[PDB]
Structure 1
């Protein structure tokens, strides 16, 4: 996977936005196109609207979700069945 020396990855703009909202009593939805961003404890407790190709699907972060990419929690394509 992602090599250890490299650290995590998180788009700087997304990381900056979450850090700005850190000092907040109540969190506001963060609209992002950054599928690549990795989830952080700072991300915990927020609602992030991740772009899924055509619209920003909201996702509530939690300590269970940490350690994964945001895009994985926003399915791209819909398949109801046949």
Structure 2
């Protein structure tokens, strides 16, 4: 976890992107390479396509997802089973 006196972490380009999507008011997805960014409350209800290494998996920001990083909802290593 981060320190509490530092505040929550987000990229500047992601914050500009989500504020552009708020002033634009649309619900079209936006593809990001910013897995290390904490989900903010203004992002709720818009699908974000987070990079997992190959592709961009679209995750829908719910109310309960508002504490975690974006990359926590994008699995990087695929594994099904050894048989």
Same fold (TM over 0.5): yes
What runs of 5+ residues in structure 2 fail to find an aligned partner? none
2:43 is equivalent to residue 43 of structure 1: yes
Calculate the TM-score normalised by the size of structure 2: 0.93
Shift of 1:45: 0.6
SS in 2 for 1:2: coil
How do 1:28-67 residues align onto structure 2 when only pairs under 5 Å count?
Answer: 28-67=28-67
Calculate the TM-score normalised by the size of structure 1: 0.94
* Greater percentage in helix: 2
SS in 2 for 1:31: strand
Give distance in 1, aligned partners of 2:51 and 2:25. 26
Give distance in 1, aligned partners of 2:9 and 2:62. 18
> Hey, which bits of structure 1, 4+ residues long, moved more than 2 A?
23-26
What runs of 5+ residues in structure 1 fail to find an aligned partner? none
Matched positions, count: 82
Q: CA RMSD in A?
A: 1.0
